[PDB]
Amino acid sequence: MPQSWRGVLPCADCEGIETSLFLEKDGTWVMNERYLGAREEPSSFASYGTWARTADKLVLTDSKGEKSYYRAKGDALEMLDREGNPIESQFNYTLEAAQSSLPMTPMTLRGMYFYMADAATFTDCATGKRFMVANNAELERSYLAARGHSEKPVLLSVEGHFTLEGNPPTKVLAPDTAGKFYPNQDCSSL
């Protein structure tokens, strides 16, 4: 069984507690805890005591005679109640309000493309909403070749991402792959 354990445990009043347990062979042990994003100057306190192990269970009695329990399972050391139950906390999945910029990762879009007079628009199938499309020479040529002979928007499937343009700042769709026009059908036709 190993004798040094590290990990960062949860802090109710800080970024998290940096824990480290050291089980010396002379039967004693020394634990260290450091607060990250600490509110106090004593942002780090350490303890020691003696330790006794059974099968996996492991009991630590500090210099005060206080007790704590652990169950070693591989490289894992679990904190438990004296009853042998693992102590644990409930975690959530909430998105914190922040201010970042439009992702650049390309995503796939299916919409009715329309180009005319140096302006490109894409009426997105899914949202039925219509964004402006950054100018792309090739894409525009392609659109023309597909639409045959008419002022008809051709369905288009392309990878792209939103970005700030300005005023031909305004949200604009910017392509990350060449087109793929389907002149015959429209959105309705999965």
UniProtKB/Swiss-Prot annotation:
Motif (CXXC) on chain: 11-14
Observed effect of gene inactivation: No visible phenotype. Slightly copper sensitive. Decreased numbers of stationary phase cells bind to hydrophobic surfaces, cellular adhesion has altered dynamic properties; no induction of cpxR when cells bind to hydrophobic surfaces.
Gene Ontology cellular component list: cell outer membrane
Keyword Disulfide bond (UniProt): yes
Periplasmic side, ranges: 1-190
PTM remark: Palmitoylated.
Subunit (UniProt): Probably exists as a monomer in vivo, can however form homodimers which swap domains.
Known outcome of mutating C14S: Forms oxidized monomers
Effect ascribed to mutating C11S: Forms oxidized monomers
GO terms, molecular function: identical protein binding
Keyword Lipoprotein listed: yes
Keywords noted in UniProt: Cell adhesion, Cell outer membrane, Copper, Disulfide bond, Lipoprotein, Membrane, Palmitate, Signal
Region annotation Could contain a copper-binding motif: where it falls in the sequence: 104-116
Region called C-terminal domain, residue ranges: 86-190
Subcellular location: Cell outer membrane
Disulfide bonds: C125-C187
The record's note on its domains: The mature protein has 2 domains, the N-terminus (residues 21-100) and the C-terminus (residues 126-236) joined by a flexible linker; both domains form beta-barrels.
Membrane topology label: Lipid-anchor
Biological process according to GO: cell adhesion; cellular response to cell envelope stress; regulation of cell-substrate adhesion; stress response to copper ion
Consequence of changing C125S: No oxidized monomer forms
Protein name: Lipoprotein NlpE
Described purpose of this protein according to its UniProt entry: Involved in copper homeostasis, could be involved in both copper efflux and the delivery of copper to copper-dependent enzymes. Required for efficient binding of stationary phase cells to hydrophobic surfaces, part of the process of biofilm formation. Functions during envelope stress responses; when overproduced induces degP through the activation of the two-component envelope stress response system CpxA/CpxR. DegP induction seems to require membrane anchoring of this protein.
Region: N-terminal domain, residue numbers: 1-60
